[PDB]
Design a protein around this ligand. Structure first.
Ligand SMILES: CC(=O)N[C@H]1[C@H]([C@H](O)[C@H](O)CO)OC(C(=O)O)=C[C@@H]1O
Length: 493
């Protein structure tokens, strides 16, 4: 006869409805001799001012996210509470044998969006006919306000059990393209059966089209995923992705293949996928020095189109069956994706790597630290010839990498050229999604700022037209893909 309690720590945005603050779970249904349950809670005046209404929600599901994020797959009743009240009661009959209770709120309109712009509440008492039950707290509540915050892909959406691997792209016309692994049966990588799914926004991420499967996987060893995105200088959209067996199961004669698809109408329609594995490695490769290589995949998220028009993604390539490590090469095209070539080797024992354009026209590459090498720090390299040749740049190091994909944006802050990098803070785990700012002139990283506390993994970022940052992250143990919008001052002033 015990209650367990979880405070909620997901972000919120103005005017959102029925946002959970804390939820509690009874160990058992109320007994037949129970007439009413009554829950007492604490809620600071600072939180009270930022909400317009409270509610007690009752459900037969114990959910991770806000109940409306499940688009009806969670069933609940909702009972309002005056914001000034600190207790509420409900009849056993109305609970109808259910065990999961949520204290939720409607978020007001005003906001300052600073680091201290947070919301919290705590359940202090759950009494059944005046008998307090033992209460155990597993997590506190702290919900930060952002300019935008929306779960774009939630486990269960459209009948897929899971979602992973976010990719985000803003077009020259302002269209937002969001893509992801639709991980149908569970959260594991290829060779599992996986689709590529998409949603679009034409209003800067205020609203999003219904999700559309654009590449359908056809069974185990026949799925697709790990999408990266660019817009070419001629204006076409380009996705690149892998499909087939797993990374370490690929071979020269039976590869996990690399594909590209293009769109000429802002992501509405896409060309039938085109196998470009033969430009890279394996049995159909024209370069005999790469015909015995085993595997290649481009880092999911975004590529980079250079000022010349050269299209680039970083591939991480397995050259030997005698080792489980990868080497980085830039995959590029100077003819709008018609043909593809590889740079010289950019990193030895690398992994998922990302590119960004330096103020002086050099290319900066950020390299995932796979295998807890060295000091468990993120790796960096530099190229001065548009990605053809590379050199390690230790002076950019200085942030921890638990072994996870992330992203870079070149931005101006207070007149000064800086790199914004997204990565889990950890330590040594995929936890607390954070961003850092690297100052070009001083060569020092900022202290991290945690955007989403809790389990956090892959992230992609884009610069919106008005300077806001779109931040697309893997939140939680069973992952939802979440689009968050903030400006730099919200995080760093
Ligand atoms: C094609 C592929 O396998 N991509 C996977 C990537 C890769 O396995 C690793 O980067 C190599 O070390 O890892 C992860 C991961 O969450 O860690 C997710 C990707 O789906």
């Amino acid at each position: 006869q015990e209650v367990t309690m979880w405070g909620d720590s997901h972000g919120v945005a103005p005017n959102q409805v029925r946002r959970t603050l804390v939820k509690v779970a009874l160990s058992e249904s109320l007994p037949p001799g129970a007439k009413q349950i009554r829950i007492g809670f604490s809620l600071p005046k600072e939180t009270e001012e930022k909400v317009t209404a409270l509610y007690l929600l009752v459900s037969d599901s114990l959910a991770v996210r806000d109940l409306p994020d499940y688009k009806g797959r969670v069933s609940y009743d909702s009972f309002p509470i005056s914001k000034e009240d600190r207790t509420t009661a409900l009849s056993a009959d109305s609970v109808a044998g259910r065990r999961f209770f949520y204290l939720a709120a409607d978020i007001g309109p005003v906001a300052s969006f600073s680091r201290s712009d947070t919301l919290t509440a705590r359940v202090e008492e759950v009494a059944v006919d005046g008998r307090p039950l033992p209460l155990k707290e597993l997590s506190p509540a702290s919900r930060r306000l952002y300019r935008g915050y929306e779960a774009l892909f939630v486990p269960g959406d459209g009948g897929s059990r899971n979602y992973r691997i976010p990719a985000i792209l803003k077009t020259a016309n302002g269209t937002l393209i969001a893509m992801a692994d639709r991980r149908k049966y569970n959260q594991t990588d290829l060779p599992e059966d996986i689709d590529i799914v998409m949603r679009r926004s034409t209003d800067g991420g205020k609203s999003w089209s219904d999700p559309r499967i654009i590449v359908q996987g056809e069974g185990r060893n026949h799925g697709f995923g790990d999408v990266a995105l660019v817009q070419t200088q001629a204006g076409k959209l380009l996705m690149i992705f892998v499909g087939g067996v797993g990374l370490w199961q690929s071979t020269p004669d039976r590869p996990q293949r690399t594909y590209i698809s293009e769109s000429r109408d802002e992501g509405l329609t896409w060309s039938p996928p085109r196998d470009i594995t033969h430009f890279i490695f394996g049995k159909d490769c024209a370069d005999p020095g790469r015909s015995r290589w085993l595997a290649s995949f481009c880092a999911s998220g975004q590529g980079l189109v250079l000022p010349s028009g050269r299209i680039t993604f970083v591939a991480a390539i397995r050259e030997s069956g005698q080792e489980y490590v990868l080497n980085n090469y830039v995959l590029y095209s100077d003819d709008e994706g018609d043909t593809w070539q590889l740079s010289d080797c950019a990193y030895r024992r690398g992994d998922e790597a990302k590119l960004s354009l330096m103020p002086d026209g050099r290319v900066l590459m950020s390299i995932r630290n796979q295998g807890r090498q060295e000091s468990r720090q993120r790796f960096f390299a530099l190229s001065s010839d548009d990605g053809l040749t590379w050199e390690r740049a230790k002076q950019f190091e200085g942030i921890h990498d638990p072994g996870c994909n992330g992203a870079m944006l070149q931005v101006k802050r207070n007149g000064r050229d800086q790199v914004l990098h997204s990565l889990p803070l950890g330590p040594d785990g995929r936890r607390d999604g954070a961003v850092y700012l690297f100052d070009h002139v001083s060569g020092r990283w900022s202290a991290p700022v945690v955007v989403n506390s809790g389990s956090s993994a892959y992230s992609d970022m884009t610069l919106l037209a008005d300077g806001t940052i779109g931040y697309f992250v893997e939140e939680g143990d069973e992952i939802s893909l979440v689009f968050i919008r903030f400006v730099l001052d919200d995080l760093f002033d």
